[PDB]
Design an enzyme around this catalytic site. Structure first.
Site, PDB file in Angstrom:
ATOM      1  CD  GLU A  11      -2.968  -1.077   0.298  1.00  0.00           C
ATOM      2  OE1 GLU A  11      -3.105  -0.041  -0.388  1.00  0.00           O
ATOM      3  OE2 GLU A  11      -3.699  -2.061   0.158  1.00  0.00           O
ATOM      4  CG  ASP A  20      -7.401   3.651  -5.178  1.00  0.00           C
ATOM      5  OD1 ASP A  20      -8.187   4.072  -6.064  1.00  0.00           O
ATOM      6  OD2 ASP A  20      -7.732   2.764  -4.366  1.00  0.00           O
TER       7      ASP A  20
END
Length: 175
Positions: A11, A20
């Protein structure tokens, strides 16, 4: 290596709100906030969506952050989110039996998937979950790759799939 270190690698760590690949405003270590509009969607909509994300962040942190958090705050959201991911697996009728059947390293791989796609999303990999429960590692690996998941984030998917395949942390060494 453990689930925290593993997800920290996959992440990353960002202290300011970002978008994202799935179009979600996110911050910290994969902490999802809200969905963003279209690259087009009005000049207005854009700003509203941004404040909506900041609103979610402030609520999660309990402070007026204006979209910026500290490393310690990112780690606090992360601890909550990992716990939530595991808690969800345990409460889900389809994921719990698979999870309980797996060794510790493979359990981390499943938590990783749930952290990324959410409980209902992973519970949907019906055939892969069965192959995992049967310890048919190579077949599970082949099935897991036939997914939007893999096509969208292949390098990460490959590390998770390799972890299910081998039961080792090989894919995360030197990372």
């Amino acid at each position: 290596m453990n689930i925290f270190e593993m997800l920290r690698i996959d992440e990353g760590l960002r202290l300011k709100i970002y978008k994202d690949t799935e179009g979600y405003y996110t911050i910290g270590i994969g902490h999802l906030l809200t969905k963003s509009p279209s690259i087009n969607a009005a000049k207005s909509e854009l700003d509203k969506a941004i404040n909506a994300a900041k609103s979610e962040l402030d609520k999660a942190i309990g402070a007026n952050t204006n979209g910026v958090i500290t490393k310690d705050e990112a780690e606090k959201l992360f601890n909550q989110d990992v716990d939530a991911a595991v808690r969800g697996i345990l409460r889900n009728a389809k994921l719990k039996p698979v999870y309980d059947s797996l060794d510790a390293v493979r359990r981390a791989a499943l938590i990783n998937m749930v952290f990324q796609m959410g409980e209902t999303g992973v519970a949907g990999f019906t055939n892969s979950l069965r192959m995992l429960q049967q310890k048919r590692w190579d077949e599970a690996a082949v099935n897991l790759a036939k997914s939007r998941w893999y096509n969208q984030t292949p390098n990460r998917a490959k590390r998770v799939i390799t972890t299910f395949r081998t039961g080792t942390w090989d894919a995360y060494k030197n990372l």
